[PDB]
Amino acid sequence: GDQRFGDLVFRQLAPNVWQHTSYLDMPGFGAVASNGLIVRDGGRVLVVDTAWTDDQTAQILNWIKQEINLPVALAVVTHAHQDKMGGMDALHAAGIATYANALSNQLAPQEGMVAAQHSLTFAANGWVEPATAPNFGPLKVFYPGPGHTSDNITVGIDGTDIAFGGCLIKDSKAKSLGNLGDADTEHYAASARAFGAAFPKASMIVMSHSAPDSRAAITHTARMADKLR
Ligand SMILES: S=c1[nH]nc(-c2cccnc2)n1C[C@@H]1CCCO1
Ligand SMILES: [Ca+2]
Ligand SMILES: [Ca+2]
Ligand SMILES: [Zn+2]
Ligand SMILES: [Zn+2]
């Protein structure tokens, strides 16, 4: 049921939701998948995360034009690392309004990423301040606290069973929390737990580097993170 367009793979998760997957061949690891989301919101499309590269990101947009044929209104990118923000220039060239955590945009230059056009800010309880996320339709943006990076954010899709943990959440059989080069090992477990509590009825948990899982991914990630303190 999965579809290939250029270097990208797409999988439909729900009537109005698809996962996009892009690959980069890394020293040491070889080919590494990274996943984001595409959401049809009535007459428009919303994107979560770029692909690794601008070329791959343009392939997402072309697949959307071909298969969905609705304007892409905006994209939310989930932290300032290549897998999630590598394709910003491609979104900007296509005229898609981009949104990231303020902190992602502040870190972006140091991390070699291009900042988004707009900054999301968050309350103490993690929820986006709504004036910063105008007309986000079903996307509910949550900052769960520092974990994979200090700026990692997460998104739930209202009206669906789906929530996206990005690179904070690992699958429920994972052996480790993977890339911890920029991680907050002290607060990781609470941040994983906070994402779970923010989206308490999501049953399909989508994440950057494994296929969609159940809520078990959340509790497994938190259990692994507990051992880093
Ligand atoms: S996660 C996360 N954050 N940054 C990156 C990344 C890594 C290497 C180069 N550019 C970005 N990754 C993904 C990989 C996945 C497993 C190893 O790290
Ligand atoms: Ca670029
Ligand atoms: Ca870094
Ligand atoms: Zn990262
Ligand atoms: Zn990642």
How deeply is 128 buried, as exposed, middle or buried, from its count of CB atoms within 10 A (0-12, 13-18, 19+)? buried
The DSSP H or E segment spanning 69 is: none
For 140, the token pair is 């509910």
The CATH number given to whatever domain includes residue 109 is 3.60.15.10
Number of domain units in the chain: 1
For 204, the token pair is 């399909």
Nearest CA to ligand 1 atom 18: 179
Strands 17-26 and 204-206: unpaired
Full domain range(s) for residue 108: 3-227
Q: What is the 3-state secondary structure (H, E, C) of 134-177?
A: CCCCCEEEECCCCCCCCCCCEEEECCCCEEECHHHCCCCCCCCC
Measured in degrees and rounded to the nearest 5, phi and psi for residue 62 equal -70, -35
Q: Is 81 in the pocket of ligand 1 (CB under 6 A)?
A: yes
Among 29, 49, 52, 82, residue to substitute to test ligand 1 (most atoms within 8 Å of Cβ): 82
- Experimental determination technique: X-ray
Alpha helices in 33-181 (DSSP H): 54-67, 82-85, 88-93, 102-107
The 3-state DSSP composition of the chain as helix, strand, coil percent (nearest 5) reads 25, 30, 45
Q: Is 79 in the pocket of ligand 1 (CB under 6 A)?
A: no
184 annotated to bind ligand: no
For 200, the token pair is 């308490």
For 137, the token pair is 């339709």
- Non-local CB neighbours of 194 within 8 Å, separated by 6+ positions: 126, 142, 144, 145
81 annotated to bind ligand: yes
For 48, the token pair is 């979560």
**Ligand 1: centre distance to CA 179 (Å):** 6
